[PDB]
């Protein structure tokens, strides 16, 4: 055995469409090229011992286990390889349902194609059922150790490749729009949309989030003070540096009890939270000091009450959550002692990040909060209460999330946006504290904590009791207001012979309309006027260059068949497609020795056409004229020859042809003819004294037609080309 060539395709592809993900390898069978595995004897029990999940694999049969029967009867180890990788990258969570083989040209090299959902992983998978298949017949068995350690690397392989949650809720939230999302590679940030209908976003930060916002936000005294001054309730305080002043302080608060905190400090350090007597406020205002950087502490009033987490996205409230605190109830007459495996039956809790409702953490903090708490681990709540086991309120810590959106006062609502917007920010999460959120905040003492900047939301996604929010399908919204989506006019252009002639002529036509075209073709890409790369591929990668340019509005791509090959299409689909002509002028290379298959090849950039699209295909080529069927979208016909019968057909039913009558190049539109020019003051075409010229300047018309540009534009760009 051993590893020839190892691709991996991203887009539609020869293989398949809509498919996108899969690999692609070549498989040197020197010695086994002509061996059944039924013919090598006790491999079937091996097989079926090392992985006995492959009972499983339903097979052409269609019947359990039929994959086991088909290797019963005797066959080409081509077909095990690639269950067995499936099976392999299966054990690993990892959902996939697509494999195909293949015989080369030569009798020793098999192609086999594997479908993948992350790269790395697919890539290590295929490579490791080969190595398990060469052991396996190497030896008759594969060890478990081997196999763990493999089934733990494709794990970790997964895990490295992974978002955020809330990363792939809104990618999820985008796909299921039918809008298109790439990743860029500076810092884990995802762009949805082409051209200069693109926005960006990293985790719930979009590109219209203000510096100026973000950072007021972070700074809680700076927010504080802002809010004050818009008269939004907030919490009482009062700066002091001396002892003897912290009396006179408390006076201003309104008495007991208060909360001391110090000026300059991150993530809460040496802040109180509740002390209702004078020495306690004594010991924590030393210790905040020694905490202090600047020997001054802040003492504000303590507000009592339930705490709420508010959403706002574009200034509307979306989710409004409730937290309770970390607790246990002992409505089954239990303490905590059955209560702890009472909890850890509920397949909701776990560790990591991810998971709303996480392990409780028996710590000596919580410890002795709870024997503080006022109760005891045998102590059987009074009349059925709630008793907590930590104050911090925290989901992350074991929290509890109730949906409170329904039930809102308007006004509490408005006074909420006021905030989000006076702050400065597209998506807020505010942090309330209210006897009630039903009524306003001014019967109440009602205030509002701390605004955060990017905040998530999976809190309102799994609130665990209550309504799920749709907060990916409101900041979806946000980011495209209408029924719109990020697309913009993309012409894809293939063929045998005139590629590069027709780009330069689309780009030249439309170039003349008011628009920015960005085309990339053999010779270099280009972005409207001036030239972008010289030393440019025709593959996916000028593609990506191209639709990433916030001022490219129409994409004009030449697609050879070597990207298609290597790498597949760089775009899912196209608003039109042009196939010039197929010819078997050179052969050989990869898989593609006859010329149905280099038409096969071809017909991706037909078939890969949007229902709204058009497929701009030549009549004269039976080829090419065959790829009718198999597209979704409309077929306009192009032919040098007026009197083409396929072509009077599809225009007496219907229409959009172009045609070379009597030294015109003519449009029909159904009953009607429209002349375009006399293919004498085409500079191209040299008075008419090149006929290849002139079928590349009818695709071009009929294409640019199709988009709906003025004819006098088209004639100007046509007059004007040179080559």
């Keep these: 055995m051993k590893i020839l060539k190892l691709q991996t395709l991203r887009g539609p592809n020869y293989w398949s469409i809509h498919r996108h993900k899969l690999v692609v390898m070549r498989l040197d069978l020197e010695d086994l090229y002509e061996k059944y595995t039924s013919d090598i004897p006790g491999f079937y029990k091996g097989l079926t011992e090392v992985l006995p999940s492959l ?60 479908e993948y959902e992350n790269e790395q992983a697919g890539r290590y998978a295929a490579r490791a059922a080969v190595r398990l298949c060469q052991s396996i017949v190497d030896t008759g068995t594969y060890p478990a150790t081997e196999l763990q350690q493999d089934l733990e690397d494709l794990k970790e392989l997964k895990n490295q490749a992974s978002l955020g949650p809330s990363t792939e809720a809104i990618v ?66 009062t700066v002091a540096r001396y002892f003897d002043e912290l009396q006179d302080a408390i006076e201003y608060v309104g008495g007991y009890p208060i909360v001391i905190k110090p000026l300059d400090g991150n993530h809460g350090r040496g802040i109180t939270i509740d002390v209702k007597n004078w020495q306690e406020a004594e010991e924590a205002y030393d210790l905040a000091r020694k905490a202090s950087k600047t020997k001054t502490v802040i003492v504000e009033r303590y507000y009592t009450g339930k705490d709420h987490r508010v959403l706002v996205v574009n200034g509307k409230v979306v989710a409004v959550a409730e937290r309770v605190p970390a607790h246990v109830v002992g409505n089954g007459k239990s303490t905590i002692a059955e209560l702890i495996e009472e909890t850890n039956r509920d397949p909701q809790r776990g560790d990591g990040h991810d998971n709303i409702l996480t392990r409780i953490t028996v710590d000596k903090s919580a410890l002795d909060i709870l024997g503080k708490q006022g109760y005891s681990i045998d102590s059987i709540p009074l009349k ?102 990020g697309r913009i006019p993309i012409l894809s252009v293939t063929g045998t012979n005139g590629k590069t002639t027709t780009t330069r002529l689309l780009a030249h036509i439309i170039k003349q309309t008011g628009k920015v075209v960005g085309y990339t073709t053999t010779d270099g890409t280009y972005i409207g006027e001036y030239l972008a790369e010289t030393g440019d591929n025709t593959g996916p990668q000028s593609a990506h260059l191209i639709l990433s340019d916030p001022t490219v509005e129409v994409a004009v791509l030449e697609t050879a068949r070597g990207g298609i090959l290597r790498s597949g299409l760089g775009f ?29 090849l071809k017909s991706v950039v037909a078939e890969s056409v949007m229902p709204k699209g058009y497929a701009v295909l030549n009549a004269e080529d039976p080829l090419v004229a065959a790829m009718a069927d198999r597209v979704k979208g409309q077929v306009a016909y192009f032919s040098m020859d007026p009197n083409n019968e396929l072509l009077l057909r599809h225009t007496e039913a ?18 009607w003819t429209l002349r375009i020019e006399k293919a004498v003051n085409v500079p191209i075409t040299m008075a008419g004294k090149a006929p290849f010229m002139i079928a590349n300047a009818l695709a071009a018309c009929l294409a640019v037609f199709t988009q709906g540009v003025k004819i006098e534009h088209i004639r100007k760009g046509l007059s004007t080309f040179v080559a």
């Design 572 to 600: 899912s689909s196209c608003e039109v497609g042009i196939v010039l002509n197929v010819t078997a002028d050179h052969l050989g290379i990869g898989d593609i020795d006859t010329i149905e298959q280099l038409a096969k």
């Design 172 to 237: 999820k939230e985008a796909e299921a729009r039918g809008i298109p999302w790439t990743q860029l590679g500076a810092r884990f940030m995802i762009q949805f949309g082409y051209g200069v209908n693109q926005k960006k976003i990293q985790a719930t930060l979009s590109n219209q989030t203000g510096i100026l916002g973000v950072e007021l936000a972070c700074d809680k005294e700076g927010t504080k003070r802002i809010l004050k001054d818009a008269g939004v309730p907030v919490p009482r305080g």
């Design 55 to 114: 009972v499983e694999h339903l097979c052409s049969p269609g019947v359990k286990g039929g994959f086991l029967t088909r290797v019963e009867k005797g066959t080409l180890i081509g077909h095990v390889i690639e269950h067995v990788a499936i099976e392999l990258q299966e054990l690993a969570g990892m959902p996939v349902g697509f494999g195909r083989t293949r015989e080369t040209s030569t009798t020793g090299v098999f192609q086999v194609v594997i």
């Design 654 to 671: 219907g229409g959009l042809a172009a045609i070379y009558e009597n030294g015109y190049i003519s449009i029909l539109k159904g009953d």
């Design 384 to 485: 059925g209460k709630k008793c907590f086991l930590r104050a911090t309120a925290n989901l992350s810590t074991g929290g509890i999330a109730v949906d409170r959106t329904d039930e809102i006062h308007p006004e509490n609502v408005w006074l909420l946006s006021r905030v989000a917007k006076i702050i400065g920010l597209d998506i807020a999460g505010i942090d309330v504290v209210t006897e009630d959120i039903s009524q306003p905040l001014r019967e109440v003492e009602g205030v509002i904590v701390e605004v955060n900047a990017a905040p998530g939301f999976r809190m309102h996604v799994a609130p665990s009791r209550g309504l799920a929010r749709n907060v990916a399908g409101a900041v979806m919204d946000m980011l495209f207001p209408g029924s719109k989506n």
